[PDB]
């Protein structure tokens, strides 16, 4: 019945003023890509940075089990696009935000499915 909650721990550490996890692997790319959130190759647009996925996953970086009951990682082996304004904390960003399953963009940072 006891499971460590690292998501909450990082959120609380950030709220208390702790420095974001560093050394997320930022990629060189054209920055003319689709802007989708998580892709098989860097896809940053003009307003994003692309990073190697594993280096942006809290669970990978902390050496802890993934919440997936299969242990599968959403980011490992892929690239994540982070808004440039949030690129100082890619791990925080991926943790706190969710990807739209329809258009593949970050909800609130590119997803327009809920327009009209």
């Amino acid at each position: 019945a006891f499971a460590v909650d690292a998501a909450k721990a990082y959120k609380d550490y950030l709220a208390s003023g702790g420095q974001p996890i560093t050394n997320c692997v930022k990629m060189l790319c054209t920055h003319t890509g689709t802007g989708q959130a998580i892709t098989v190759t860097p896809e940053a647009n003009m307003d994003q940075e692309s990073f190697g996925g594993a280096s942006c996953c809290l669970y990978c970086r902390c050496h802890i089990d993934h919440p997936n009951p299969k242990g599968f990682c959403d980011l490992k082996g892929k690239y994540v696009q982070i808004p440039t304004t949030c690129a100082n904390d890619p791990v925080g960003f991926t943790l706190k935000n969710t990807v739209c399953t329809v258009c593949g963009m970050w909800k609130g940072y590119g997803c327009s499915c809920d327009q009209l």
Partner: protein, 301 residues
């Protein structure tokens, strides 16, 4: 110039043809650093320029390509180089990496331990190594051919590199091995490639392009390393990050290079010619299986 807009500089053929004696490496821009794009790590830049140069060579690029990457962990616990290789390689490429210490990676599989503990059933289309021990940068002792992980790398190449495949192995003034230079002559072509972002270092990548499995040319590696140092000592390379800003042609092209299983008797000159041109890979196409030897000990008493 123009060299400042390239990803780096390869050793000119004439320097490979010399018979120099080994000297100390003295680089005019030693200690200087290139201006990297904002927030970009040296190892991302370095691997990017390495891959940009590899794009200019005749690499075989088959479907279900297999690549292994040694020395893939950093002191930050991540794998910048692997992240660049995976970006460069076609989506779906099988990518394995390894290092002595634990690290998190984007590779399909990661083996932790001394490279000598790594075993694989299958053959590989491309081998990348950044293995390096900075304790070799000792100026007060003679600079002799090194063994250690270089002995492993030479055997791994002769045993597990597919015909047609290529390698890029990191060396420096003191981190080098004579047999590896000798093995360079078992490829259709070879060079020592210096990245423009790290031009102030004696680092180079020894690249062997299209493996032939036999000596095409006889190379004395003690001499060739001296030739490499002589080149570097007499040809300052201007630090440059220019090529990092143009990534439009970065992806390695999926050439669909043919893969065939073949036996030593069937390797004729036609085959050898196709291998030498980047148009054929020879190896089985079975499943890729790897393992890491683990030493078992009970310290209780």
């Amino acid at each position: 110039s123009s060299q400042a807009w390239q990803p780096g500089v390869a050793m000119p053929n004439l320097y490979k043809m010399q018979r120099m004696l080994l000297e100390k490496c003295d680089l005019q821009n030693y200690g200087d650093s290139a201006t990297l794009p904002k927030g970009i790590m040296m190892n991302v830049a370095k691997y990017t320029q390495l891959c940009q140069y590899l794009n200019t060579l005749t690499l075989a690029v088959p479907y279900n390509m297999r690549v292994i990457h040694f020395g893939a962990g950093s002191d930050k616990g991540v794998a910048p180089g692997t992240a660049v290789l995976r970006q460069w390689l076609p989506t779906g490429t099988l990518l394995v990496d390894s290092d002595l210490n634990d690290f998190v990676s984007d590779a399909d599989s990661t083996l932790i331990g001394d490279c000598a503990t790594v075993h694989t059933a299958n053959k590989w289309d491309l081998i990348i190594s950044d293995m390096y021990d900075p304790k070799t940068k000792n100026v007060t002792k003679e600079n002799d051919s090194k063994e250690g992980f270089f002995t492993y790398i030479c055997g791994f190449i002769q045993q597990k590199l597919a015909l047609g495949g290529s390698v890029a192995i990191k060396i420096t003034e003191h981190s080098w091995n004579a047999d590896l230079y000798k093995l360079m002559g078992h490829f259709a072509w070879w060079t020592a490639f210096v990245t423009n972002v790290n031009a102030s270092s004696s680092e180079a990548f020894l690249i062997g392009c299209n493996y032939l499995g036999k000596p095409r040319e006889q190379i004395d590696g003690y001499v060739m390393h001296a030739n490499y140092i002589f080149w570097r000592n007499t040809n300052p390379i201007q630090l440059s990050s220019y090529s990092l800003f143009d990534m439009s042609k970065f992806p390695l092209k999926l050439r669909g290079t043919a893969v065939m299983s073949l036996k030593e008797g069937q390797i004729n000159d036609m085959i050898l010619s196709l291998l030498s041109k980047g148009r054929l890979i020879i190896r089985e196409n079975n499943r890729v299986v790897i393992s890491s030897d683990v030493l078992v000990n009970n310290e209780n008493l």
